[PDB]
Design a protein around this ligand. Structure first.
Ligand SMILES: NC(=O)c1ccc(Oc2ccc(C(N)=O)cc2)cc1
Ligand SMILES: NC(=O)c1ccc(Oc2ccc(C(N)=O)cc2)cc1
Lengths: 197, 194
């Protein structure tokens, strides 16, 4: 477990409320406000989930081995409804719970480059108190290609070797704005931003 | 990486054909012939997939912690078509890829004879059928039902603390369904005929 996490004393899960003015809070706030400056942040919590981290880091090490000196990890956003927050906090991102996207590049979990995308009410649905929720997520995008509706895994790199797959897919490889991942533990929910109009 | 695996020559995936009449082949054959003695075994292969094993073992260590003094693993069978074999060997089981009456997960049989049905181990254009012997983290389980995308919660007061798998009958299970990647490791592939 990372050394700057708070001591969980044998607990395996904790949400840690960050302080404004700390670099950790400010970097996330800046990343969000880059495209969402009309919204206001209520709080930013660091998600410390030991099991999700372990499984994710194993996948990352594997992808770092398999890929040739790639930057396999991107820090992306994911807007979701209040009802999904307890599940994501404990269990991460489950493709089986994902709705069809308005522009589908495949049946998987969607992550945005820009917070403005995840800030749409269709993703970060405002709760009964008007709070919207967006995760900041370490995502193993790896080597990617343009996706296609109806993918249930990323496509093969080579049609003559159907089992050797891209790591994720995107809407546009030149200018990616979303990534879709198709496997468990390919995304670690790192921060939860609660925010309002 | 398990002692009985044989040397991989720095590869991370290989399928190793077992030698008939030695301990390991005998053990796996016996599990199969317990209910499928009328079939003909052509070969048994050990699946040495380092990445899948790693991810599985992590999940097992986590399950052993979460459940605290439980026997969380069962050895089960999974019949599939020949066209799915390269995928399973390399990537394991994927719920996103038959009936799903106990939930939308991957199905494993207690008895080889259930996986031996042509509807599961579809005979290929040569008559060959394929069945895996699978280490499955069944953990604590409950009865399944149609439409589940994860197992039920153990108590709907804590909706995120879930059963590990579901079954058709908790008292005398004949199948188990798991809903997460890396909860099952395909350990052997049996190629056989009717
Ligand atoms: N849920 C999300 O935040 C989301 C991100 C990128 C998308 O494209 C669609 C949805
Ligand atoms: N692929 C397999 O080996 C396998 C498939 C279905 C399994 O479970 C079921 C067996 C029968 C029924 C049924 N409703 O008759 C449902 C599931 C177990 C294993």
């Amino acid at each position: 477990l990372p050394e700057h996490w708070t001591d969980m004393n044998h607990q395996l899960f904790c949400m840690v409320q960050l302080e404004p003015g700390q670099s950790e809070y400010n970097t996330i706030k800046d990343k969000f406000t880059r495209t969402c400056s009309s919204y206001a942040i209520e709080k930013i919590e660091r998600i410390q989930n030991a099991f999700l981290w372990q499984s994710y880091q194993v996948k990352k090490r594997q992808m770092d081995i398999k890929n040739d000196h790639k930057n396999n990890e991107r820090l992306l956003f994911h807007g979701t409804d209040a009802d999904s927050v307890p599940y994501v906090n404990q269990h991460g991102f489950n493709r089986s719970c994902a709705g069809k996207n308005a522009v589908s590049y495949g049946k998987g979990t969607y992550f945005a480059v820009d917070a403005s995308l995840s800030a749409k009410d269709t993703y970060s649905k405002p709760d009964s108190n008007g709070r919207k929720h967006m995760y900041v997520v370490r995502v193993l995008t790896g080597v990617f290609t343009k996706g296609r509706a109806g993918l249930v895994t990323p496509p093969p790199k080579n049609p003559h070797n159907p089992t050797d797959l891209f790591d994720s897919v995107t809407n546009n490889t030149r200018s990616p704005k979303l990534f879709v991942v198709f496997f468990d533990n390919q995304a670690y929910p790192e921060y939860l931003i609660t925010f309002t109009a």
